[PDB]
Design a protein around this ligand. Structure first.
Ligand SMILES: Cn1c([C@H](OC(C)(C)C)C(=O)O)c(-c2ccc3c(c2)CCCO3)c2ccccc21
Ligand SMILES: Cn1c([C@H](OC(C)(C)C)C(=O)O)c(-c2ccc3c(c2)CCCO3)c2ccccc21
Lengths: 136, 136
């Protein structure tokens, strides 16, 4: 898969929203707990993601996610164009480590840590950096 | 500089706090607007950062930043150990693009985008991925 392709969806838990971004070629995840599945949060998140990685295209399982003017604006400024078990495993790990933390967001980040680091023989963390580097 | 060394400080603007993390070998930045210079925010931020990069050691210009139990806990779980003009330039870019955005945090992320991407002949975005990849 092209190095700059990302997938973006929301899953819910404890009545809070989790924005989940996956680098499709590597399986590396960036996640964030947001209070509201609003376009403002998706725009802001896209801005951070594009700042830290080469984000060329973004796919989603809910196209209406990318429809507000706020989201379209972020995509415009950042040069972003429109176009799994990752979410299932992530929710598995969240479940496993949820007791170890008071807040859901702490567990969410713990699960991102585990997922990105556990070697599957590189780990998603290693594969993404490898891919993007090679592409340079 | 060792590939896994990071620097972490807070600067203030419009009466809000900006957590700024710099990968010392590359100059790549991750920033976030937080409401309160509290240890809970530093812990949470460290968790995200360690999830997405190899974070071995963290230096700061304010050691008391790393003193609360919440911060020490995040460092423990993540395997993190304790140990510029980057902040000045970042504040420059924020200033330049501040008018283009309602919220300070939107401008902060815009400035991170510019900084990470502008080639200085790679850009900080390219140098960090190169370094960490080579180190693999
Ligand atoms: C509230 N709280 C938390 C944690 O929330 C924040 C990180 C946002 C502060 C939470 O929801 O349980 C921590 C804590 C910090 C680090 C950390 C972990 C928990 C779990 C494993 C990974 O590393 C913590 C520590 C001392 C007092 C209070 C705390
Ligand atoms: C409030 N607001 C913002 C923006 O705040 C959020 C991103 C958090 C929603 C803000 O503070 O000005 C945007 C916006 C979205 C993208 C974007 C930019 C501004 C500037 C350049 C980079 O790309 C936006 C668009 C339509 C309506 C309302 C908006």
């Amino acid at each position: 898969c092209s190095p700059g392709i990302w997938q973006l969806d929301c899953t819910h838990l404890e009545g809070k929203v989790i924005l989940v971004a996956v680098h499709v070629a590597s399986g590396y995840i960036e996640a964030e707990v947001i209070p509201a599945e609003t376009g403002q949060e998706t725009a802001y998140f896209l801005l951070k993601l594009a700042g830290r990685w080469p984000v060329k295209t973004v796919h989603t399982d809910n196209g209406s996610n990318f429809t507000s003017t706020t989201v379209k604006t972020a995509c415009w400024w950042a040069g972003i164009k429109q176009e799994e078990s990752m979410n299932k495993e992530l929710k598995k790990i969240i479940g496993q480590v949820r007791d170890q933390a008071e807040h859901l967001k702490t567990a969410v980040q713990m699960a991102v840590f585990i997922h990105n680091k556990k070697r599957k023989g590189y780990s998603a963390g290693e594969r993404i950096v490898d891919i993007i580097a090679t592409d340079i």
